Design an enzyme around this catalytic site. Structure first.
Site, PDB file in Angstrom:
ATOM      1  N   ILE A  96     -51.735   2.028 -61.472  1.00 43.12           N
ATOM      2  CA  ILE A  96     -52.358   3.288 -61.010  1.00 43.12           C
ATOM      3  C   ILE A  96     -52.349   3.292 -59.474  1.00 43.12           C
ATOM      4  O   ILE A  96     -52.340   4.405 -58.906  1.00 43.12           O
ATOM      5  CB  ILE A  96     -53.774   3.458 -61.613  1.00 43.12           C
ATOM      6  N   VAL A 134     -53.992   1.550 -65.862  1.00 48.94           N
ATOM      7  CA  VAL A 134     -55.240   2.068 -65.234  1.00 48.94           C
ATOM      8  C   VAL A 134     -56.357   1.037 -65.423  1.00 48.94           C
ATOM      9  O   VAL A 134     -56.912   0.938 -66.540  1.00 48.94           O
ATOM     10  CB  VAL A 134     -55.588   3.436 -65.815  1.00 48.94           C
ATOM     11  N   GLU A 135     -56.722   0.322 -64.349  1.00 53.49           N
ATOM     12  CA  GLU A 135     -57.726  -0.761 -64.418  1.00 53.49           C
ATOM     13  C   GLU A 135     -58.695  -0.652 -63.245  1.00 53.49           C
ATOM     14  O   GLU A 135     -59.348  -1.665 -62.875  1.00 53.49           O
ATOM     15  CB  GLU A 135     -57.019  -2.107 -64.569  1.00 53.49           C
ATOM     16  N   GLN A 136     -58.930   0.551 -62.780  1.00 51.06           N
ATOM     17  CA  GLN A 136     -59.966   0.760 -61.752  1.00 51.06           C
ATOM     18  C   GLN A 136     -60.507   2.166 -61.898  1.00 51.06           C
ATOM     19  O   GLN A 136     -59.786   3.033 -62.459  1.00 51.06           O
ATOM     20  CB  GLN A 136     -59.348   0.486 -60.388  1.00 51.06           C
ATOM     21  N   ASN A 172     -57.857  -0.991 -69.316  1.00 53.33           N
ATOM     22  CA  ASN A 172     -58.935  -1.887 -69.776  1.00 53.33           C
ATOM     23  C   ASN A 172     -60.263  -1.171 -69.771  1.00 53.33           C
ATOM     24  O   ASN A 172     -61.283  -1.862 -69.976  1.00 53.33           O
ATOM     25  CB  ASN A 172     -58.956  -3.164 -68.952  1.00 53.33           C
TER      26      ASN A 172
END
Length: 294
Positions: A96, A134-136, A172
Site C-alpha cells: 500500500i 494493506v497492513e497500515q 492483516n
C-alpha cells in the site's frame, strides 16, 4: 485427485485433466514466492518459480526491490509462459506504501499516473493482475490517494474491468478498514494474513468482510517458516494438526470459503528454526490442496 502424489510436472492428457480441474469449482491455493529467493536472483538460492506445483492456482511475485535484473528477465521470458502452461495465474504484489507515495500528485491526474505506472508492472511481464498488501491505517489524504488509485486500476483489473484480470486486496486488518469500505466494489479476491492466529477467531474476521463479498472471494493465509524470521508456528508437525491444515479444513458457518494462501511458498516443508535455504517438492502445498478438495 487428478493432481500428482509427488511434484511431477504433467505433459499430455494428464496435464489437460489438471487444466480442466482448475476451470471447475474447487477451493483455490495461492502462494507468495519471495522474488529475492528465486534461483534467478542473486546467489545462494535453491528454489525456482519453475518448481511450483501443477495444482497451484495463483503464484504471487513478491519482491523487496534488491532483486537482480536477471530475475525480471527470467520471469518475463521463462517463468510466466511455463506457469501459464500449467494454468497457474501469476500476480504482481505491491505494498500500500506504493499507492500513498507523495511523489505522485494527490489528484485525479496523479491517481491515473500512479495507476499507469503500477499497470506497467503487470502488462510488461504478461501477468494476470495486481495484489495490494494493506497492513497500515491511512490518514484522510492517504485514504483519498489510495482510493483514487484503486478506482483507476479498476478500469483495467478486477470485477469492474471485464478483462478477466485480477485486483486483489491482501491485508492483516478487518472489513472495518476505511480503505476496504471505499474499494470493495473493485476487488476480485480478499486475502486475510492470518499468521499465528486462533482458529476460534476466524469467523469474527470473516463476518467483518462478508457483507462486501461472496464467500468464494475470501482466502485465509498461513506462513511457512522464513529463514531468520518470525516463529508463527503455522506449519508445526504433525501436518494434520498444524494451523495450515486447520485453515484448509475451516469453513465459515453455512458457506464455502474461496481457499487459502501461504506466505513464503519458496519455504514449503523447511523445519521451523532451520535458517539454511533448501530445495522443496511443495509437499505441504500439494497436501493442503488435497485437504481442501477431497
Amino acid at each position: 485427485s487428478v493432481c500428482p502424489s509427488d511434484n511431477t510436472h504433467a505433459t499430455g492428457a494428464a496435464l489437460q485433466k489438471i487444466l480442466d480441474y482448475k476451470k471447475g469449482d474447487h477451493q483455490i491455493m495461492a502462494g507468495y514466492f519471495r522474488s529475492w529467493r528465486d534461483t534467478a536472483s542473486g546467489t545462494g538460492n535453491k528454489v525456482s518459480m519453475l518448481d511450483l506445483p501443477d495444482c497451484l492456482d495463483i503464484a504471487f511475485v513478491f519482491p523487496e526491490g534488491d532483486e537482480t535484473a536477471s530475475f525480471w528477465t527470467t520471469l518475463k521470458d521463462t517463468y510466466v509462459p511455463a506457469l501459464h502452461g500449467r494454468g497457474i495465474k501469476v500476480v504482481r504484489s505491491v505494498g500500500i506504501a506504493q499507492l500513498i507515495n507523495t511523489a505522485w500528485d494527490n489528484t485525479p491526474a496523479g491517481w491515473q499516473g500512479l495507476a499507469d505506472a503500477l499497470m506497467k508492472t503487470v502488462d510488461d511481464y504478461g501477468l494476470d493482475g495486481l495484489d495490494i498488501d494493506v497492513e497500515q491505517s491511512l490518514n484522510a489524504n492517504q485514504l483519498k490517494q489510495a482510493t483514487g488509485v484503486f478506482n483507476a486500476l479498476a478500469k483495467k483489473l478486477g470485477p469492474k474491468s471485464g478483462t478477466g484480470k485480477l485486483l486483489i486486496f491482501d491485508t492483516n486488518m478487518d472489513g472495518t478498514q476505511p480503505l476496504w469500505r471505499n474499494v470493495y466494489p473493485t476487488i476480485s479476491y480478499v486475502l486475510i494474513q492470518s499468521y499465528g492466529r486462533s482458529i476460534s477467531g476466524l469467523q469474527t474476521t470473516y463476518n467483518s468482510f462478508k457483507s462486501y463479498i461472496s464467500s468464494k472471494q475470501y482466502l485465509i493465509g498461513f506462513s511457512f517458516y522464513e529463514e531468520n524470521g518470525t516463529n508463527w508456528g503455522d506449519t508445526t508437525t504433525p501436518m494434520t494438526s498444524s494451523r495450515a491444515w486447520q485453515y484448509a479444513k475451516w469453513q465459515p458457518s453455512g458457506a464455502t470459503k474461496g481457499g487459502i494462501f501461504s506466505y513464503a511458498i519458496d519455504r514449503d516443508g523447511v523445519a521451523i528454526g532451520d535458517n539454511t535455504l533448501k530445495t522443496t517438492d511443495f509437499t505441504w502445498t500439494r497436501q493442503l490442496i488435497g485437504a481442501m478438495n477431497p
